[PDB]
Amino acid sequence: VRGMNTSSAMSAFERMEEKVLMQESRAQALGELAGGSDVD
Amino acid sequence: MGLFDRIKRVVSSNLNDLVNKAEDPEKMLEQAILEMQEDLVQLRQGVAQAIAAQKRSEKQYNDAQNEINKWQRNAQLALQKGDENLARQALERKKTYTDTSAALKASLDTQSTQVETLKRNLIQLESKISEAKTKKEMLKARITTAKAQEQLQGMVRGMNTSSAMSAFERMEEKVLMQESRAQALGELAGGSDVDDELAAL
Amino acid sequence: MGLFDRIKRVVSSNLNDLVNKAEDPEKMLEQAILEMQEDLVQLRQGVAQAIA
Amino acid sequence: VRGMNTSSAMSAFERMEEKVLMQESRAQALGELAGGSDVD
């Protein structure tokens, strides 16, 4: 399960998952920072 | 609080951050999956032993049941050949087998329930590992999305995250400066009249 | 969790990905088949003893 | 059997099988990405 750390394998898996999500969030924020009615 | 506790907390907080920098997502995801599967394999064998023990218990139950009828047949053979002595003695002994049959079936039932629960758990674990194996590919897709978006931002004029854009903009500015030099040199050393025709037509 | 466990997990995750890059399908398929057949041969002999 | 890894030979065989299927899927996706009533 996501929220418990009894197993080392899940610990590592979730840690890498969070690292990658953070990296993508960094990319998105950098996108924002530097910068359908009509077709409806 | 203490002092040795504090020193060891500092040393640990340094070593852990040293390690967490070496971890690389693309490889540790696979390593986690590999160990996941190893553990599942080692659980299969426990389930197998449970099943084998159930087979043994049912076989014992069947054999006791068969001996019950065997001794009933022995009683009938006594009735055919012998007398009431052997005929009654056969059932006298058959008492024990009738007892043991139920005494064993009671536990055989619980054993069966346990084996069923174990099989269910094994299937659940297989499903969850498959889900994780899909999540790994989804995470790789996210990595690619991140790198693509970072590529796009490097294309904007005012930021220097990408070396290619750095060089491109540098040459652009150099050339604009050269043209400005030419224009200034032009100035340094050195439409009302034709708008009248617009009145003609 | 532990620390030595974590270090060894990192080292293992590196060596395994190093090896999995060397594997080439066209050859490892044949190698797997070859060992498959070897095992079958070694089982024939057990069956033969049973028959004898 | 496909889903269990008790034998090393099968482990390797299935691993190569999945690698090749993934390679073919890559080719097909690359085909899509870059781009019978009438004869009935």
Residue numbers in the entry:
A (entry chain A), D (entry chain A): 156 to 190, 203 to 207
B (entry chain A): 1 to 190, 203 to 213
C (entry chain A): 1 to 52
Quote what the paper states about this structure.
The ESCRT-III-like protein Vipp1 couples filament polymerization with membrane remodeling. It assembles planar sheets as well as 3D rings and helical polymers, all implicated in mitigating plastid-associated membrane stress. PspA activity is triggered by agents that threaten inner membrane integrity, including phage, mislocalized secretins, and antibiotics, whereas Vipp1 is a plastid component in cyanobacteria, algae, and plants, in which it functions in thylakoid membrane biogenesis and repair. Given that two-dimensional (2D) planar sheets share a close geometric relationship with helical lattices, and as a means of understanding the interconnectedness of Vipp1 polymers including rings, spirals and planar sheets, we determined the structure of four Vipp1 helical filaments by cryo-EM.
Specifically, Vipp1 and a Vipp1 interface 3 mutant, Vipp1-F197K/L200K1, were assembled using equivalent helical parameters and lattices and were termed Vipp1L1 and Vipp1F197K/L200K_L1, respectively. Vipp1F197K/L200K_L1 was resolved to 3.7 Å overall using helical parameters of a rise of 2.44 Å and a rotation of –75.83°, which were almost identical to those of Vipp1L1. Overall, Vipp1F197K/L200K_L1 and Vipp1L1 subunits were in similar conformations and assembled using equivalent helical lattices. However, owing to the Vipp1F197K/L200K mutation, interface 3 formation was inhibited, with no supporting map and build for helix α5N. The key difference between the Vipp1F197K/L200K_L1 and Vipp1L1 maps was the presence of lipid bilayer in the central lumen of Vipp1F197K/L200K_L1. Here, the inner leaflet formed a tube with a diameter of 4 nm, close to the limit at which hemifusion is expected to occur. Concurrently, the outer leaflet filled the space between the helix α0 stacks. Analysis of the Vipp1F197K/L200K_L1 electrostatic surface potential showed that amphipathic helix α0 was positively charged, with basic residues positioned to attract negatively charged lipid headgroups. In Vipp1F197K/L200K_L1, the ESCRT-III-like protofilaments were rotated ~43° to the membrane tube axis while maintaining similar lateral interactions and ultrastructure by undergoing filament twisting. Overall, Vipp1F197K/L200K_L1 showed how Nostoc punctiforme Vipp1 helical filaments have the capacity to tubulate membrane, as reported in other Vipp1 systems.
